[PDB]
Amino acid sequence: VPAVGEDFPIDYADWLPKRDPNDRRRAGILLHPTSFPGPYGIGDLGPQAFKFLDWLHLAGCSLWQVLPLVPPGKRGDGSPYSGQDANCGNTLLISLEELVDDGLLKMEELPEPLPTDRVNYSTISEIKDPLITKAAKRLLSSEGELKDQLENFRRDPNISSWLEDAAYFAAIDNSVNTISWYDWPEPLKNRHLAALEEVYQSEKDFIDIFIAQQFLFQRQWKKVRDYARSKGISIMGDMPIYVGYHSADVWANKKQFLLNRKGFPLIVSGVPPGQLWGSPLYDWKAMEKDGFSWWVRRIQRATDLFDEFRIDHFRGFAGFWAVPSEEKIAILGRWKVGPGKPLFDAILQAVGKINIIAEDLGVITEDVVQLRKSIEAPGMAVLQFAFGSDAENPHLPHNHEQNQVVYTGTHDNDTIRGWWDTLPQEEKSNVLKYLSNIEEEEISRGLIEGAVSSVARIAIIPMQDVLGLGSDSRMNIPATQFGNWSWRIPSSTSFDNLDAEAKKLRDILATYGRL
Amino acid sequence: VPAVGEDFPIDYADWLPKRDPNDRRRAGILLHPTSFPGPYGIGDLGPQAFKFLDWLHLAGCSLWQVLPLVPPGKRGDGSPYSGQDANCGNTLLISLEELVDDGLLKMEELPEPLPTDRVNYSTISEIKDPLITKAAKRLLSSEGELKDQLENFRRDPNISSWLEDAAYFAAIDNSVNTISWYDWPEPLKNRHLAALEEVYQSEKDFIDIFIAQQFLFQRQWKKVRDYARSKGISIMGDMPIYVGYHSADVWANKKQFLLNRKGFPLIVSGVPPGQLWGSPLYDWKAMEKDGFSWWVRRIQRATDLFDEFRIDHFRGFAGFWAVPSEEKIAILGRWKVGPGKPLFDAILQAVGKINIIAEDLGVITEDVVQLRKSIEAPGMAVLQFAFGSDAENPHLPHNHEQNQVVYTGTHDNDTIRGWWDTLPQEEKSNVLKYLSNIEEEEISRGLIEGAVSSVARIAIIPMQDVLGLGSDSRMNIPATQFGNWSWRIPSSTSFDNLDAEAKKLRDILATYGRL
Ligand SMILES: *[C@@H]1O[C@H](CO)[C@@H](O[C@H]2O[C@H](C)[C@@H](N[C@H]3C=C(CO)[C@@H](O)[C@H](O)[C@H]3O)[C@H](O)[C@H]2O)[C@H](O)[C@H]1O
Ligand SMILES: *[C@@H]1O[C@H](CO)[C@@H](O[C@H]2O[C@H](C)[C@@H](N[C@H]3C=C(CO)[C@@H](O)[C@H](O)[C@H]3O)[C@H](O)[C@H]2O)[C@H](O)[C@H]1O
Ligand SMILES: [Ca+2]
Ligand SMILES: [Ca+2]
Ligand SMILES: [Mg+2]
Ligand SMILES: [Mg+2]
């Protein structure tokens, strides 16, 4: 500007305040693709994914939130948070119809329509796995555009940085079949170069098929993401802070983790009173020495899948609970100093600006708040947690801030109707008083409008709440072992029959500036 | 914290996030003391002030907002924004009952009860001025504690820095009686030291009485502020950015203003299309040279009266419209560069942390937003301005921020009921839709709850809205010449009969975390 007291330009008054596009108010739906309806026992990245994104666009939503897309471990269950690998895609999400379109499968090979209500994780692999393998084998023997794209995918330096290790790990797991790589024969456990060369010779078809399957996943997921972008929809993903011990992530990167000389975890994850989670812990001291290269690669893959993502247990970057691996419960651990902002500095330098959502629920310490504010990451508000304490409860709308994501509830919460059904009478009248004496019969509308009308720049509604569903549609009960991750949109409900639900959401998005 | 990877203390989990007392959510009432009821034609700093603060405390409010407390100029009208002086108190606010308590007036000298509905600014001075003068004369001839306190007040270096000039200015104005000091005899206009010595000799009684009156004001206002503090109530004041030409502020500080060699303004204030306000403009270049001493003294006096205060036309600190003083309308001016943050740096250095509210209504430029955010000053939201454009209207609750003050309406707005009565049908249905399909009959409750439930850390309700009053109770219609600043609480309404109104406000303060 000119000196104090001097004339501004004649056009000074045109200099109106700048709206930053990253402050745009948006609404989204939480819907894991396993939950899409269809005839093959599990939702997929096929026709229903495009039908869903058309419905979202009709509803005026500009965000779609999914759970982790990794292959769930089968040491039970279908949990997206117990993955076999941090970077691979769940091959059960591959659309059999899109592979028929590609010429990789024949109409005739498709199974007869399966029961539609719920995912049966005990049977779905045995049905789909042989068909995905058949398609992969046809791709590997093909000589067209898709073969060229497979070759470009497998030679991409970002892809090969995790996929080669993931494929060799899977080939060895299949062949040796121990509970953990801890018990592998020493040449495979300790990655003797000559032993790995022999694995490629004896397990070549397995490794090539595994890689082709990851290409088929990548190509279908990129078609979905491209379609979402064409409709102005961003995809928000999710990642656990910790990875599983029995994975290529640990076996191929042992010095990134706090293991003993035999590769057994010295300390494992959990929370004090408490909860023993049992993941191996990062050697954050050793990671700082190489510029957090392992974490940079994990974030690079996450940005390949998602526009933005949550990190579950974000508090672990500030401080983490470490339990001696011999211990069988959480009580006897210690809080350890997390890497803090220098991890996020390294990621910015290497990958540029990322939109990370900090999962910051429950008892968190001041250093977690300071770390989140230091990287300008939004935290969470969950309305189903707002009404059981006092008016300083940070989940109440009057305590929300602009740089925040508000939920009615996540995949870890009951549906609004299920939550209301088991809510104590004292807490119900509190809810109804807060939401301005609305009637018990309109509690869904009240909580959804409470989220959409928040100052929080992102509001997310689970699809179960749009469809008016009860506790029978809850995705997860934390710590329970059965009935989880299996909810599907019923076969009788089609996106083409939900125009009224889309209009009802669009009208409140318009009123509260999210459209 | 310890090094990355090392143990935290055993007590890490006790380190809960820090609530800063300056982020405390509060509610207040806007009520200028002229509006207090009583039998002497105008509200005062007497019994009704203490009755009001008891009511506020019963209502759970922790803030009281008043307009400027300066003596209104009589070149018409009662406007607190057209003051005779920036630093003096309005002697019409002096309680005649408290002076009877002090022994400075006799019961018998009190007038017979006057008409109670409205302030008559054309008659109130002629009634009260002679009585305040009588009390001042008794103080001046007295020999007790109050005489000692008067001597300590008039010798206080902060007080004397404005009061001596204010008293001499008033003595000369009374004696010479021109429309402006521009036309004073040269020795008084240009403050010849020998002419000022002669003024003290010939106008000694006037000057001593003027000073005693300012002491009587100070002492009554400090009793009110002390009582407010005892009840956990802060007082928020208000100040126009500009002062009036015909004042001690300009006459005793001519080089702080852009005047010609004869003391006539070179340029005057206003806004482009437009509005010619006609105040003299600050020489912000000359002010920076002495560390903004004049502004520091004005802020020091404001903190003597108020816990926190609004600055009206805060945008003038970034950029100001300057109209050539010969011009008779606003169109032919230029925007000039305001002093910016260095003024606020000087105030911090000299007076310490102040809580300033930025009046930032209407078309403001990006530099005004940057300046306000650079000193962490809250701006305003006014709900009566929210509903006539689109969902990006910054006055809508979903666009509010924590560091903000929300109003239903200010003294410049109609009452909620008056505003609703002249609101176009299209804007009414918009309002009712936004506030969640509430009924037209409950619009007052709806707008008050919309303010109290905001994320804005301060919510302010005019007393006219608590009392359910219509357009006949509006304090000001901007640019109009009559009927303004004269509303009083009717004689039939007493604070002791408002327990239901206090409880209704207290209950929503409890629900929305302002108690
Ligand atoms: C945030 O991340 C949570 C876990 O870190 C996730 O919790 C869900 O998924 C967990 C994997 C699950 N634990 C199961 C898996 C095991 C095998 O490694 C067992 O140790 C546990 O006893 C199993 O229950 C949690 O139960 C489950 O809530 C959240 O969903 C996610 O939001
Ligand atoms: C913010 O500040 C406003 C003015 O700066 C104030 O406006 C009210 O008070 C003004 C003094 C008034 N103008 C009158 C006074 C004059 C004598 O100097 C005339 O020039 C004008 O023509 C008069 O009308 C405004 O009309 C009035 O709105 C706001 O109230 C305050 O919030
Ligand atoms: Ca096995
Ligand atoms: Ca006069
Ligand atoms: Mg070896
Ligand atoms: Mg002279």
In sequence order, the β-bridge partners of residue B287 are none
DSSP 8-state assignment for residue B376: T
| Chain B residue whose CA is closest to A288 | B4
| Cross-chain residue pair B1–A337, CB shorter than 8 Å | yes
φ, ψ (nearest 5 deg) of residue B364? -125, 155
A11 is catalytic: no
| Cross-chain residue pair A398–B453, CB shorter than 8 Å | yes
Record the tokens describing residue B439, joined without a space.
Answer: 């009924």
Residue A297 to residue A158: CA distance in whole angstroms: 8
Residue A327 to residue A333: CA distance in whole angstroms: 9
Residue B406 to residue B394: CA distance in whole angstroms: 11
Record the tokens describing residue B332, joined without a space.
Answer: 């032919």
Neighbours of A362 (CB within 10 A): 9
Record the tokens describing residue A212, joined without a space.
Answer: 């082709």
Task: Calculate ∠ Cα A97-A103-A106, nearest 5°.
Answer: 65
Residue A69 to residue A486: CA distance in whole angstroms: 15
CA distances from B183 to A132, B190, B269 (A): 98, 11, 21
Residue B239 to residue A363: CA distance in whole angstroms: 44
By Cβ distance, the residue of B284, B319, B449 closest to A8 is B319
Residue B407 to residue B359: CA distance in whole angstroms: 12
Residue A236 to residue A411: CA distance in whole angstroms: 14
Contact assessment for residue B329 and residue B376, using Cβ atoms and an 8 Å cutoff: no
- Using CB atoms within 10 Å of the CB of residue B260, give its burial: 0 to 12 exposed, 13 to 18 middle, 19+ buried: exposed
Residue B206 to residue B191: CA distance in whole angstroms: 18
Listed residue (B238, B215, B185) closest to B94, CA to CA: B215
| Chain B residue whose CA is closest to A317 | B4
Label the pairing between strands A334-337 and A319-324.
antiparallel
A412 is catalytic: yes
Which residues are within 8 A (CB) of A278 and not within 5 positions of it... i.e. 6 or more apart?
A: A245, A268, A269, A270
By Cβ distance, the residue of A338, A369, A455 closest to B455 is A455
- Using CB atoms within 10 Å of the CB of residue A393, give its burial: 0 to 12 exposed, 13 to 18 middle, 19+ buried: middle
**Torsion angle, alpha carbons of A444, A450, A451, A457, to 10:** 160
Residue B454 to residue B457: CA distance in whole angstroms: 8
In sequence order, the β-bridge partners of residue B234 are B63
H-only helix segments in B142-233 = 145-155, 157-176, 186-189, 193-202, 204-230
Active-site choice (B359, B414, B465, B501)? B359
Residue B273 to residue B174: CA distance in whole angstroms: 38
| Chain A residue whose CA is closest to B510 | A391
**Element (H or E) spanning B286, and its range?**
helix B284-289
The 3-state DSSP class for residue A249 equals: helix
Residue A89 C-alpha, separation from nearest chain B C-alpha, in angstroms? 31
Ligand closest to the CA atom of residue A192: 5
Contact assessment for residue B184 and residue B200, using Cβ atoms and an 8 Å cutoff: no
In sequence order, the β-bridge partners of residue B322 are B269, B334
Residue A507 to residue A24: CA distance in whole angstroms: 18
Say which amino acid occupies B407.
Y
| Cross-chain residue pair A337–B15, CB shorter than 8 Å | no
Most A-contacting residue of B436, B437, B445 (CB-CB within 10 A), to test interface: B436
- Mutating to test ligand 2, I would choose from B277, B382, B482, B484 the residue with most ligand atoms within 8 A of its C-beta, which is B277
Q: For ligand 2, atom 3, which residue shows the shortest CA distance?
A: B81
Record the tokens describing residue A461, joined without a space.
Answer: 């509604």
Say which amino acid occupies A318.
A
Contact assessment for residue A3 and residue B340, using Cβ atoms and an 8 Å cutoff: no
In sequence order, the β-bridge partners of residue B305 are none
**Element (H or E) spanning A12, and its range?**
none
Length of chain A: 515
Q: What's the CA-to-centroid distance between B193 and ligand 6, angstroms?
A: 9
The 3-state DSSP class for residue B139 equals: helix
Q: How far is CA B109 from the centre of its chain?
A: 31
Residue A326 C-alpha, separation from nearest chain B C-alpha, in angstroms? 19
By Cβ distance, the residue of A9, A364, A436 closest to B449 is A436
Q: Which residues line ligand 2 (CB under 6 A)?
A: B 79, 81-82, 240, 277-278, 312, 412, 476, 478-479, 481
Q: How far is CA B278 from the centre of its chain?
A: 20
Q: In what order do the strands lie in the sheet with B458-462?
A: B356-358, B308-312, B234-240, B63-65, B26-30, B458-462, B404-407, B379-382
Contact assessment for residue A81 and residue A68, using Cβ atoms and an 8 Å cutoff: yes
The DSSP result for B37-90, as a single string, is --SSSS--SSHHHHHHHHHHHHHT--EEE----SPBP------TTSBS-SSS--
Neighbours of B391 (CB within 10 A): 17
E-strand spans in B325-374? 334-337, 356-358
Residue B512 to residue A430: CA distance in whole angstroms: 12
B481 CA closest ligand 2 atom index: 24
CA distances from B136 to B132, B146, B202, B292 (A): 6, 11, 19, 34
CB-defined contacts A:B, below 8 A: 153
Record the tokens describing residue A499, joined without a space.
Answer: 């125009």
Task: Calculate ∠ Cα A362-A343-A309, nearest 5°.
Answer: 55
Residue B168 to residue B173: CA distance in whole angstroms: 8
Neighbours of A197 (CB within 10 A): 9
φ, ψ (nearest 5 deg) of residue B296? -55, -45
Name chain B contacts of A436, Cβ cutoff 8 Å: 436, 438, 449
CA distances from A382 to A352, A434, A450, A461, B444 (A): 29, 15, 11, 10, 30
Record the tokens describing residue A328, joined without a space.
Answer: 């069988």
| Chain A residue whose CA is closest to B390 | A513
Q: Tokens 């109440």, residue? A: A396
DSSP 8-state assignment for residue B481: -
B359 is catalytic: yes
DSSP 8-state assignment for residue B469: -
How many helices (DSSP H) and strands (DSSP E) are in chain A? 18, 12
Contact assessment for residue B309 and residue B236, using Cβ atoms and an 8 Å cutoff: yes
Residue B174 to residue A495: CA distance in whole angstroms: 83
Listed residue (A318, A249, A312) closest to A280, CA to CA: A249
φ, ψ (nearest 5 deg) of residue A221? -70, -40
Q: After which residues is chain A broken (C to N over 2.5 A)?
A: 76, 273
Q: Longest C-alpha distance within chain B, in Å?
A: 83
A76 CA closest ligand 1 atom index: 17
Listed residue (B292, B271, B268) closest to B280, CA to CA: B268
- Mutating to test ligand 2, I would choose from B70, B75, B81, B482 the residue with most ligand atoms within 8 A of its C-beta, which is B81
Name chain B contacts of A402, Cβ cutoff 8 Å: 401
The 3-state DSSP class for residue B179 equals: coil
Residue A307 C-alpha, separation from nearest chain B C-alpha, in angstroms? 25
Name chain B contacts of A331, Cβ cutoff 8 Å: none
Active-site choice (B109, B327, B367, B412)? B412
The 3-state DSSP class for residue A402 equals: coil
φ, ψ (nearest 5 deg) of residue A141? -90, 0
**What resolution in angstroms does the PDB record give?**
2.0
Label the pairing between strands B356-358 and B308-312.
parallel
By Cβ distance, the residue of A365, A392, A401 closest to B402 is A401
